[PDB]
Write an enzyme that holds these catalytic residues in place. Structure first.
Site, PDB file in Angstrom:
ATOM      1  N   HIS A 351       0.580  -1.187   0.174  1.00 47.64           N
ATOM      2  CA  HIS A 351       0.114   0.034   0.041  1.00 47.64           C
ATOM      3  C   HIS A 351       0.823   1.386   0.052  1.00 47.64           C
ATOM      4  O   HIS A 351       0.200   2.399   0.055  1.00 47.64           O
ATOM      5  CB  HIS A 351      -0.830  -0.265   1.137  1.00 47.64           C
ATOM      6  CG  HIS A 351      -1.717  -1.256   1.267  1.00 47.64           C
ATOM      7  ND1 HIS A 351      -3.272  -1.015   0.997  1.00 47.64           N
ATOM      8  CD2 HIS A 351      -1.478  -2.285   1.816  1.00 47.64           C
ATOM      9  CE1 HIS A 351      -3.552  -2.101   1.164  1.00 47.64           C
ATOM     10  NE2 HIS A 351      -2.960  -3.156   1.775  1.00 47.64           N
ATOM     11  N   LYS A 542      -8.677  13.821   5.229  1.00 43.06           N
ATOM     12  CA  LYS A 542      -7.638  12.717   5.197  1.00 43.06           C
ATOM     13  C   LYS A 542      -6.752  12.982   6.420  1.00 43.06           C
ATOM     14  O   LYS A 542      -6.550  14.018   6.782  1.00 43.06           O
ATOM     15  CB  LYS A 542      -6.920  12.660   3.969  1.00 43.06           C
ATOM     16  CG  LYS A 542      -6.271  13.867   3.637  1.00 43.06           C
ATOM     17  CD  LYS A 542      -6.498  14.443   2.296  1.00 43.06           C
ATOM     18  CE  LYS A 542      -5.789  13.505   1.015  1.00 43.06           C
ATOM     19  NZ  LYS A 542      -7.186  12.920   0.270  1.00 43.06           N
ATOM     20  N   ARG A 543      -5.979  11.981   6.555  1.00 45.45           N
ATOM     21  CA  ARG A 543      -4.805  12.137   7.479  1.00 45.45           C
ATOM     22  C   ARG A 543      -3.994  13.245   7.466  1.00 45.45           C
ATOM     23  O   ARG A 543      -3.577  13.573   6.116  1.00 45.45           O
ATOM     24  CB  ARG A 543      -4.131  10.719   7.769  1.00 45.45           C
ATOM     25  CG  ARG A 543      -5.074   9.695   8.509  1.00 45.45           C
ATOM     26  CD  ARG A 543      -5.269  10.149  10.171  1.00 45.45           C
ATOM     27  NE  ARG A 543      -4.150  10.203  10.729  1.00 45.45           N
ATOM     28  CZ  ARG A 543      -3.681   9.249  11.786  1.00 45.45           C
ATOM     29  NH1 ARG A 543      -4.428   8.142  11.747  1.00 45.45           N
ATOM     30  NH2 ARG A 543      -2.631   9.363  12.494  1.00 45.45           N
ATOM     31  N   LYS A 548       0.436  14.480   1.658  1.00 49.00           N
ATOM     32  CA  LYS A 548      -0.832  14.606   1.056  1.00 49.00           C
ATOM     33  C   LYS A 548      -0.751  16.286   0.949  1.00 49.00           C
ATOM     34  O   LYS A 548      -2.016  16.621   0.282  1.00 49.00           O
ATOM     35  CB  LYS A 548      -1.882  14.254   2.315  1.00 49.00           C
ATOM     36  CG  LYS A 548      -1.910  12.789   2.339  1.00 49.00           C
ATOM     37  CD  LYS A 548      -2.947  12.240   3.540  1.00 49.00           C
ATOM     38  CE  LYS A 548      -2.802  10.610   3.709  1.00 49.00           C
ATOM     39  NZ  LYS A 548      -3.664   9.922   2.564  1.00 49.00           N
ATOM     40  N   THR A 650      -8.673   6.626  -1.168  1.00 48.25           N
ATOM     41  CA  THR A 650     -10.106   5.839  -1.447  1.00 48.25           C
ATOM     42  C   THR A 650     -11.175   7.257  -1.224  1.00 48.25           C
ATOM     43  O   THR A 650     -12.265   7.089  -1.520  1.00 48.25           O
ATOM     44  CB  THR A 650     -10.337   4.755  -0.435  1.00 48.25           C
ATOM     45  OG1 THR A 650      -9.819   5.249   0.929  1.00 48.25           O
ATOM     46  CG2 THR A 650      -9.305   3.750  -1.288  1.00 48.25           C
ATOM     47  N   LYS A 654     -14.887   8.268  -2.906  1.00 50.28           N
ATOM     48  CA  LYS A 654     -15.917   8.660  -1.899  1.00 50.28           C
ATOM     49  C   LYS A 654     -16.654   9.860  -2.458  1.00 50.28           C
ATOM     50  O   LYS A 654     -17.708  10.008  -2.809  1.00 50.28           O
ATOM     51  CB  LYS A 654     -15.756   8.666  -0.623  1.00 50.28           C
ATOM     52  CG  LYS A 654     -15.229   7.321  -0.178  1.00 50.28           C
ATOM     53  CD  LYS A 654     -14.614   7.596   1.324  1.00 50.28           C
ATOM     54  CE  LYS A 654     -13.694   6.552   1.828  1.00 50.28           C
ATOM     55  NZ  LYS A 654     -13.348   6.791   3.108  1.00 50.28           N
TER      56      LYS A 654
END
Ligand code: OX2
Ligand code: PLP
Length: 810
Positions: A351, A542-543, A548, A650, A654
Site C-alpha cells: 500500500h 484525510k490524515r 498529502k 480512497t 467517495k
C-alpha cells in the site's frame, strides 16, 4: 419514506415495535419513564441484531456443509465506523425501523448518532479492509476478517487553542452489542523462549504464554442473506500467570497490554516491541484458528485449495514464517513441501512506496521475541538468494539488494522482501502504484518472478458510501435506473443518457444543496460555527501528512485571502474551505500543520473585508461517521498529493460517487478516475511522476519558486513575520524552513499550476448548470471504483474463487 430504504410492512413494523419494547424491558432493564436516548439506541440495536443471528448461523452452517475455499483477510486494522444503519441497509430494514421507531415516538436518526464509531483503524488502509469485508459478503465469498480487538481505537481529536489534543477512544465504555465473545475458542500465543535442536526437529521452549480470546462480529452482505464473520482477538493472561500475590495479579496487565491500543500512525513505521507483539499475536492466533478449521472439514497438499491468506500490507507478514513453523516444527512436513504450501496460500498487498512507512524490524528484536521465526527467516533468505544467484550469476549487488536481511548499523529484516518471497501474488492498489512497484522498489523481484506482480485498483463499498450516507442521491438515481446498481455500480453509466435531462440536472443539484444545508446546520449544532450554504464547499479530509500536502491547500487559501484584501470590491466565487484529519501524536510537522490551518482561520474568518466570501474551517475529529456527513455535502474534492506518493487513495472515490468534482494530481487512483470520467471532467494539475523524477535528478530548489513568484513570496513573508501568529511571531518557523530548505514533497513546484487550476474551478461553479452536468458525468463513471469490482478481481485472479450474487434462503 424513500424507495431504496425497503418496505415498511404492517406485520414487520408491529413485530419490530414489540421486540424493541421487549429489549428495553428485559435487556436494558428500563421502562419508558427512565429510559434515555442511549437506552433507546441499544434497544434498537439489539432488535436489529436479532435479525442478523438467524442468517449468521445458517451462513456458517452453509460453509461447513459445502466446504468452499476459505478467504482469510489478515489486517491489524479494520475501520468499521458505525454498524446500526449499515446493518439495516443490508437487511432492507431501514424504512421499517424508521416507521416502528416513529410510532414509538422516537427519531431514529437521533438514535443512530448515539452509536460509537468502531475506530480500529487509522485511515485508508483500515477503511479498505472494512469495505472489502462488505463486498466479500455481498459477493457470497466464504471470507473471514481477522484482526485485533483494540480496547482503544484511533484517539478522539480535540482542538484546543488551535492545537490538536488527543484523548482515549474508550469505545467499549457502554458495551458493544454487535460483538459476540467466543471464550470457548481461546488459543495460546507464545513469546520469547529459546530454540532447542533435538534428534528429530527443533523445539521452541521456555516461552511466555498469552491467551488470544476471539470476539466475532457479523458482516452482512447486501440483501443476499449472507452474514460473514470478522474475528478480532483480545489478549488475556493465563491464570497461573506470574503465579507478592497482589503484584502478580496486577502484572497481568503486562500481557494484556498487547490488545490495549491501536498505534495511531498512518503511513509511518514505528519499530516498537509492543507493535511487534501485536503483529505476531494476531498472526499466531489466526493461523491456529485457520488450521483448526481446515482439519475439521493431514492433507496439507490441499491446504492451498481450501485456504487463501491475504496480507494487508506487511503488518501480518509473520504469517509466512509462522505457517512454516507450524508445518515444519509441528506437523513435521519437509521444508520444501511446507514452503510450496505457504507460497500457494499467501498473497501480499502493498500500500505504499514511502521509505518511512516500510517495515524493517531490527534483528535483535526478533532474536529475543521470536527466536524460531528469526531462524526460519534466515533459512528462507538463504534459499531465496540461492535462487537469485542462479538466475543472475555473478550479480553480487542484486544479492545484497534483494536480501531479506539488511546489513548496516543494526541488521534489520525487510518485511516487504519476506512477503514477496513467500507469496504467490503481490499487488499494488492502483495502476500507477503497481507500475511504480515494478519499476522501482520491487524491480529486482519483478525481474526474478514477473508472474507474481499484479494490480488491484482499490474501491469503496457503494452501500455505506452512497445508499447509507446519501439516500437522497441514491433515490433520484434509482428513480431513473432502478436499484440494481447498488450491487452492480457499473450500471451508473446509464446516467450518461440523463446528462441533458433538465429534470435530473435539477434533482442532482437539489440533493447536493440539501446535503450542504444539513451539514451547515450540523456545524452549528455540535460545533457552533456559522457558514454560508451558498458558497462552494472546498474540502480536504484525510490524515494529516506532508505527502498529502494540506500545506499546498493552505497556500491557496492564503492566496485567495491576499487577493481579496488587494481588491476588496472585486467579485469572487464564495468558498468555505474545509480541512480535517488527525495527526499522529508524535508527528510534529503534522501537528504544526493543524495549528497553521486554525491560525489561518482565525485571521480569515474575522476579517470584516472578507465577509462571507471566504471561510476556513478545520473539521475536528475526522472519522468514518464524520466522513459520511461531509462527503455528501462537498462540491470540490482535494486530492493533491505529490505525484507518486499516494498509492491509491480512497477518499477520492467517495467524493466522486457523491457528486463532488475533483481537483487533483495524476497520483494513485486519481489517474484512473480521470480516465473513466474523461480528463475534461476532472481538474488535473501539477507535475506527473516523470516531472517529479526530472526535478529530483536536477535537484529541487524551492528558493527558485520563491524568487520568481511574487504571490508565493508574500505568503512566506507573512508566515515568517508572524502575520498569522501575532503573539508568537516565529511560531511557524519550522514550516517555512521545511518549505524553503527540505521539502521532500515539492509544495512550491505545484503552486502556480494549482492556483491556476483553482481559478478554472471557480469559473465553472459560476455556471450551476454546467457544473452539475460535469458532476453527472463523474457520478455516471464512478462504477469501476466499487469494492465489489475490486474483490471480484482478487477472487478470480488471486484467490481462485468465483463470486456469487445468489441469495441464501433467509
Ligand atoms: C502503508 C499504508 N498505510 N496506509 C496506507 C494507505 O492505504 C490505502 C488503501 O490501499 C491507500 O489508498 C493509500 O494511498 C495508502 O496511503 O498504506
Ligand atoms: C476513506 C477514509 C480515509 C482515506 O482517505 P484518503 O483521502 O484516501 O487518504 C481516511 N479516513 C477516513 C475516516 C475515511 O473514511
Amino acid at each position: 419514506q424513500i424507495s431504496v430504504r425497503g418496505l415498511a410492512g404492517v406485520e414487520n413494523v408491529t413485530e419490530l415495535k414489540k421486540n424493541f419494547n421487549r429489549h428495553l424491558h428485559f435487556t436494558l432493564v428500563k421502562d419508558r419513564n427512565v429510559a434515555t436516548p442511549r437506552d433507546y439506541y441499544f434497544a434498537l440495536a439489539h432488535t436489529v441484531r436479532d435479525h442478523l443471528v438467524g442468517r449468521w448461523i445458517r451462513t456458517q452452517q452453509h460453509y461447513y456443509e459445502k466446504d468452499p475455499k476459505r478467504i482469510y483477510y489478515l489486517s491489524l486494522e479494520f475501520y468499521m465506523g458505525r454498524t446500526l444503519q449499515n446493518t439495516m441497509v443490508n437487511l432492507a430494514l431501514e424504512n421499517a425501523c424508521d416507521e416502528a421507531t416513529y410510532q414509538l415516538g422516537l427519531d431514529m436518526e437521533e438514535l443512530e448518532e448515539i452509536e460509537e464509531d468502531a475506530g480500529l483503524g487509522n485511515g485508508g488502509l483500515g477503511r479498505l479492509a472494512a469495505c472489502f469485508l462488505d463486498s466479500m459478503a455481498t459477493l457470497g465469498l466464504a471470507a473471514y476478517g481477522y484482526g485485533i480487538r483494540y480496547e482503544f481505537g484511533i484517539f478522539n481529536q480535540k482542538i484546543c487553542g488551535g492545537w490538536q489534543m488527543e484523548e482515549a477512544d474508550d469505545w467499549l465504555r457502554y458495551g458493544n452489542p454487535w460483538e459476540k465473545a467466543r471464550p470457548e475458542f481461546t488459543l495460546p500465543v507464545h513469546f520469547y523462549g529459546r530454540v532447542e535442536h533435538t534428534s528429530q526437529g527443533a523445539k521452541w521452549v521456555d516461552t511466555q504464554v498469552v491467551l488470544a480470546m476471539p470476539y466475532d462480529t457479523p458482516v452482512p452482505g447486501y440483501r443476499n442473506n449472507v452474514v460473514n464473520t470478522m474475528r478480532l482477538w483480545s489478549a488475556k493472561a493465563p491464570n497461573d500467570f506470574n503465579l507478592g500475590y497482589i503484584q502478580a495479579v496486577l502484572d497481568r496487565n503486562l500481557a494484556e497490554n498487547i490488545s490495549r491500543v491501536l498505534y495511531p500512525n498512518d503511513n509511518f513505521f514505528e519499530g516498537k516491541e509492543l507493535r511487534l507483539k501485536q503483529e505476531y499475536f494476531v498472526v499466531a492466533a489466526t493461523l491456529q484458528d485457520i488450521i483448526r478449521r481446515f482439519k475439521s472439514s493431514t492433507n496439507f497438499d490441499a491446504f492451498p485449495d481450501k485456504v487463501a491468506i491475504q496480507l494487508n500490507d506487511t503488518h501480518p507478514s509473520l504469517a509466512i514464517p509462522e505457517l512454516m513453523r507450524v508445518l515444519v516444527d509441528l506437523e513435521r512436513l519437509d521444508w520444501d513441501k511446507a514452503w510450496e504450501v505457504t507460497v500457494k496460500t499467501c498473497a501480499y498487498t502493498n500500500h505504499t512506496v514511502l521509505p518511512e512507512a516500510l517495515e524493517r524490524w531490527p534483528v535483535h528484536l526478533l532474536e529475543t521475541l521470536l527466536p524460531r521465526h528469526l531462524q526460519i527467516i534466515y533459512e528462507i533468505n538463504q534459499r531465496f538468494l540461492n535462487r537469485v544467484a542462479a538466475a543472475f550469476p555473478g550479480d553480487v549487488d542484486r544479492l545484497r539488494r534483494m536480501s531479506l536481511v539488511e546489513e548496516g548499523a543494526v541488521k534489520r529484516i525487510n518485511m516487504a522482501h519476506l512477503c514477496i518471497a513467500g507469496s504467490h501474488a503481490v499487488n499494488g492498489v492502483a495502476r500507477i502504484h503497481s507500475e511504480i512497484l515494478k519499476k522501482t522498489i520491487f524491480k529486482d523481484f519483478y525481474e526474478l518472478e514477473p508472474h507474481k506482480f499484479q494490480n488491484k485498483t482499490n474501491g469503496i463499498t457503494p452501500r455505506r458510501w452512497l445508499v447509507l450516507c446519501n439516500p437522497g442521491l441514491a433515490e433520484i438515481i434509482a428513480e431513473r435506473i432502478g436499484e440494481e446498481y447498488i450491487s452492480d455500480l457499473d450500471q451508473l453509466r446509464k446516467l450518461l443518457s440523463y446528462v441533458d435531462d433538465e429534470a435530473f440536472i435539477r434533482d442532482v443539484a437539489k440533493v447536493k444543496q440539501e446535503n450542504k444545508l444539513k451539514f451547515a446546520a450540523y456545524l452549528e449544532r455540535e460545533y457552533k460555527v456559522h457558514i454560508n450554504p451558498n458558497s462552494l464547499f472546498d474540502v480536504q479530509v484525510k490524515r494529516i501528512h506532508e505527502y498529502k500536502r494540506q500545506l499546498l491547500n493552505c497556500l491557496h487559501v492564503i492566496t485567495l485571502y491576499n487577493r481579496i484584501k488587494k481588491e476588496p470590491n472585486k467579485f469572487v466565487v464564495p468558498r468555505t474551505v474545509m480541512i480535517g484529519g488527525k495527526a499522529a501524536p508524535g508527528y510534529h510537522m503534522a501537528k504544526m500543520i493543524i495549528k497553521l490551518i486554525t491560525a489561518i482561520g482565525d485571521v480569515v474568518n474575522h476579517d470584516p473585508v472578507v465577509g462571507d466570501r471566504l471561510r476556513v474551517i478545520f473539521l475536528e475529529n475526522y472519522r468514518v461517521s464524520l466522513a459520511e456527513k461531509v462527503i455528501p455535502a462537498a462540491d470540490l474534492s482535494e486530492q493533491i498529493s505529490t505525484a507518486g506518493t499516494e498509492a491509491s487513495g480512497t477518499g477520492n472515490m467517495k467524493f466522486m460517487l457523491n457528486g463532488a468534482l475533483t481537483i487533483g494530481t495524476m497520483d494513485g487512483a486519481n489517474v484512473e478516475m480521470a480516465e473513466e470520467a474523461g480528463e475534461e471532467n476532472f481538474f488535473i494539475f501539477g507535475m506527473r511522476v516523470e516531472d517529479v523524477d526530472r526535478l529530483d535528478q536536477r535537484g529541487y530548489n524551492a528558493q527558485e519558486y520563491y524568487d520568481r513568484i511574487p504571490e508565493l513570496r508574500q505568503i512566506i513573508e507573512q508566515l515568517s513575520s508572524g502575520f498569522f501568529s501575532p503573539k508568537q511571531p516565529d511560531l511557524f518557523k519550522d514550516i517555512v524552513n521545511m518549505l524553503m530548505h527540505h521539502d521532500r514533497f515539492k509544495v512550491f513546484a505545484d503552486y502556480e499550476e494549482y492556483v491556476k487550476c483553482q481559478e478554472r474551478v471557480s469559473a465553472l461553479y459560476k455556471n450551476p448548470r454546467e457544473w452539475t452536468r460535469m458532476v453527472i458525468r463523474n457520478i455516471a463513471t464512478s462504477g469501476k471504483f466499487s469494492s465489489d469490482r475490486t474483490i471480484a478481481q482478487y477472487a478470480r485472479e488471486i484467490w481462485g474463487v468465483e463470486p456469487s450474487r445468489q441469495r441464501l434462503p433467509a
